[PDB]
Write a protein that holds these residues in place. Structure first.
Motif, mmCIF file in Angstrom:
data_model
loop_
_atom_site.group_PDB
_atom_site.id
_atom_site.type_symbol
_atom_site.label_atom_id
_atom_site.label_comp_id
_atom_site.label_asym_id
_atom_site.label_seq_id
_atom_site.Cartn_x
_atom_site.Cartn_y
_atom_site.Cartn_z
ATOM 1 N N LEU A 193 0.854 -1.214 0.000
ATOM 2 C CA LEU A 193 0.000 0.000 0.000
ATOM 3 C C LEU A 193 0.864 1.228 0.000
ATOM 4 C CD1 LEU A 193 -2.804 1.367 0.384
ATOM 5 C CD2 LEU A 193 -2.426 1.142 2.854
ATOM 6 N N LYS A 194 0.541 2.244 -0.798
ATOM 7 C CA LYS A 194 1.272 3.488 -0.862
ATOM 8 C C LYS A 194 0.624 4.500 0.094
ATOM 9 C CE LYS A 194 2.526 7.602 -3.434
ATOM 10 N NZ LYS A 194 2.620 8.372 -4.699
ATOM 11 N N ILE A 195 1.376 4.954 1.092
ATOM 12 C CA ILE A 195 0.770 5.937 2.015
ATOM 13 C C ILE A 195 1.529 7.234 1.915
ATOM 14 C CG2 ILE A 195 0.186 6.709 4.320
ATOM 15 C CD1 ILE A 195 -0.138 3.742 5.125
ATOM 16 N N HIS A 196 0.781 8.293 1.650
ATOM 17 C CA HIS A 196 1.386 9.622 1.610
ATOM 18 C C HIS A 196 0.747 10.402 2.775
ATOM 19 C CE1 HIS A 196 2.181 13.506 -1.024
ATOM 20 N NE2 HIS A 196 2.387 13.748 0.272
ATOM 21 N N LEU A 197 1.568 10.739 3.735
ATOM 22 C CA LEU A 197 1.163 11.489 4.908
ATOM 23 C C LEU A 197 1.343 12.990 4.712
ATOM 24 C CD1 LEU A 197 0.298 11.417 7.995
ATOM 25 C CD2 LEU A 197 2.716 11.447 8.554
ATOM 26 N N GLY A 198 0.203 13.698 4.860
ATOM 27 C CA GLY A 198 0.226 15.159 4.888
ATOM 28 C C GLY A 198 0.033 15.562 6.358
ATOM 29 N N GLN A 199 1.093 16.086 6.957
ATOM 30 C CA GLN A 199 1.104 16.277 8.406
ATOM 31 C C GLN A 199 1.316 17.716 8.785
ATOM 32 O OE1 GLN A 199 1.343 13.785 11.412
ATOM 33 N NE2 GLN A 199 0.629 15.920 11.775
ATOM 34 N N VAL A 200 0.328 18.321 9.428
ATOM 35 C CA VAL A 200 0.391 19.714 9.841
ATOM 36 C C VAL A 200 1.300 19.888 11.072
ATOM 37 C CG1 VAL A 200 -0.866 21.731 10.730
ATOM 38 C CG2 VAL A 200 -1.923 20.286 8.986
ATOM 39 N N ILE A 201 2.229 20.802 10.967
ATOM 40 C CA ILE A 201 3.134 21.227 11.995
ATOM 41 C C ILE A 201 2.365 22.151 12.982
ATOM 42 C CG2 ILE A 201 5.020 21.334 10.344
ATOM 43 C CD1 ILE A 201 4.380 24.284 9.944
ATOM 44 N N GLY A 250 -7.511 22.415 14.473
ATOM 45 C CA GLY A 250 -8.494 22.020 13.487
ATOM 46 C C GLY A 250 -8.318 22.799 12.186
ATOM 47 N N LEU A 251 -9.274 22.595 11.292
ATOM 48 C CA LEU A 251 -9.311 23.207 9.998
ATOM 49 C C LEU A 251 -10.126 24.495 9.954
ATOM 50 C CD1 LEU A 251 -9.841 20.080 7.681
ATOM 51 C CD2 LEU A 251 -7.711 21.077 8.540
ATOM 52 N N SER A 252 -9.604 25.459 9.206
ATOM 53 C CA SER A 252 -10.366 26.697 8.988
ATOM 54 C C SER A 252 -11.597 26.377 8.155
ATOM 55 C CB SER A 252 -9.490 27.699 8.206
ATOM 56 O OG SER A 252 -9.488 27.298 6.829
ATOM 57 N N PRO A 265 9.043 19.422 0.674
ATOM 58 C CA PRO A 265 9.093 20.781 1.149
ATOM 59 C C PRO A 265 7.768 21.163 1.814
ATOM 60 C CG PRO A 265 9.956 20.651 -1.075
ATOM 61 C CD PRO A 265 9.264 19.319 -0.788
ATOM 62 N N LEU A 266 7.839 22.025 2.801
ATOM 63 C CA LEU A 266 6.665 22.562 3.487
ATOM 64 C C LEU A 266 5.656 23.075 2.442
ATOM 65 C CD1 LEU A 266 5.367 23.414 6.334
ATOM 66 C CD2 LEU A 266 6.215 25.693 5.725
ATOM 67 N N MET A 267 4.393 22.784 2.630
ATOM 68 C CA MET A 267 3.311 23.260 1.806
ATOM 69 C C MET A 267 2.147 23.743 2.692
ATOM 70 S SD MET A 267 2.536 20.442 -1.215
ATOM 71 C CE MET A 267 1.377 21.726 -2.144
ATOM 72 N N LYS A 268 1.322 24.625 2.128
ATOM 73 C CA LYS A 268 0.062 24.961 2.857
ATOM 74 C C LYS A 268 -0.895 23.806 2.725
ATOM 75 C CE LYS A 268 -0.150 29.969 2.511
ATOM 76 N NZ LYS A 268 -0.822 31.141 1.834
ATOM 77 N N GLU A 318 -4.049 27.146 8.453
ATOM 78 C CA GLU A 318 -4.509 28.446 8.947
ATOM 79 C C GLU A 318 -4.548 28.536 10.456
ATOM 80 O OE1 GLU A 318 -7.023 31.082 6.654
ATOM 81 O OE2 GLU A 318 -8.099 29.292 5.957
ATOM 82 N N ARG A 319 -4.915 27.472 11.154
ATOM 83 C CA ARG A 319 -4.986 27.509 12.610
ATOM 84 C C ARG A 319 -3.885 26.741 13.308
ATOM 85 N NH1 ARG A 319 -7.784 30.945 10.925
ATOM 86 N NH2 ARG A 319 -9.976 30.580 10.351
ATOM 87 N N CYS A 320 -2.798 26.375 12.641
ATOM 88 C CA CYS A 320 -1.762 25.542 13.248
ATOM 89 C C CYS A 320 -0.985 26.205 14.358
ATOM 90 C CB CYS A 320 -0.812 24.986 12.188
ATOM 91 S SG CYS A 320 0.398 26.108 11.523
ATOM 92 N N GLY A 321 -0.960 27.530 14.438
ATOM 93 C CA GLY A 321 -0.259 28.204 15.519
ATOM 94 C C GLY A 321 1.170 28.554 15.199
#
Length: 241
Positions: free
Chosen positions: A76-84, A193-195, A146-149, A107-110
């Motif tokens: 299985l291919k897993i691509h993790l998008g992980q908010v800092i 959470g998410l905006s 690289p960091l992304m929004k 937007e709300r990650c701090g």
């Protein structure tokens, strides 16, 4: 016994000098000497049994004794998008078979969006991933992108099933009806959470919302548990002997 990553293809090489981190770890940290064995791997899914022929200061020279396929990847291919801390997430996600990790700002990650600052950490995180593969036996090293929004990551389209946690969700990871060719894109957001605009984006992008139990999970736990849950249901964790 020790596995050492090498950052240049070893195909057709019979000898080489280990990288700076490897040379220092081998000859100074472990204080290994001429004649001792190592297992090198270059990210090609092959391992290379080797021996130390020179253990010096600033350099460790090895001979290469062979080249063998050693696939320790999930199907299985897993691509993790992980908010800092994300060091633990990177290490455990690599042990658990994640293929690609994109660190994200939301937007709300701090944390203030800072491209340059994030780039330096990612260099260090790539090294955490390398060490996790040396440890767990994986012969393909996941990329730390690289960091992304979060909104731009959500809009990437490469055939993968888009997932995100939400209390309103019907499906759980176990009951996901369809796993496509391109595997999964798992979004793990921050405590904030998410905006509203990011929620609308996950909706706009056709994300499948999922539940993950009755208890409130810290970010680190939620990512590792979802990854484990994907791997046991659709990956190599659930495979028999």
């Amino acid at each position: 016994i020790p596995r050492i990553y090498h950052p240049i293809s070893l195909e057709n090489q019979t000898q080489c000098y280990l990288s700076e981190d490897a040379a220092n770890h081998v000859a100074r940290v472990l204080r290994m000497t001429e004649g001792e064995q190592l297992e090198l791997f270059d990210g090609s899914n092959h391992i290379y049994p080797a021996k130390i022929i020179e253990s010096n200061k600033k350099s460790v020279k090895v001979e290469i004794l062979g080249r063998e396929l050693a696939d320790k990847e999930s199907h299985l291919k897993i691509h993790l998008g992980q908010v800092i801390r994300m060091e633990f997430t990177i290490q455990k996600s690599v042990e658990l078979g994640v293929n690609v990790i994109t660190p994200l700002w939301s937007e709300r990650c701090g944390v203030k969006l800072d491209a340059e600052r994030m780039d330096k950490k990612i260099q260090q995180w790539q090294k955490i991933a390398i060490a996790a593969c040396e440890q767990c036996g994986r012969n393909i090293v996941p990329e730390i992108r690289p960091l992304m929004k979060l909104q731009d990551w959500c809009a990437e389209n490469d055939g993968a099933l888009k997932l995100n946690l939400h209390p309103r969700a019907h499906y759980s990871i176990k009951t996901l009806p369809t796993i496509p060719a391109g595997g999964v894109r798992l979004l793990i957001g921050s405590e904030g959470g998410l905006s509203a605009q990011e929620i609308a984006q996950t909706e706009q992008q056709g994300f499948t919302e999922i539940l993950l139990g009755k208890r409130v999970l810290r970010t680190e736990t939620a990512s590792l548990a979802a990854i484990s849950a994907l791997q046991i249901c659709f990956g190599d964790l659930g495979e028999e002997g």
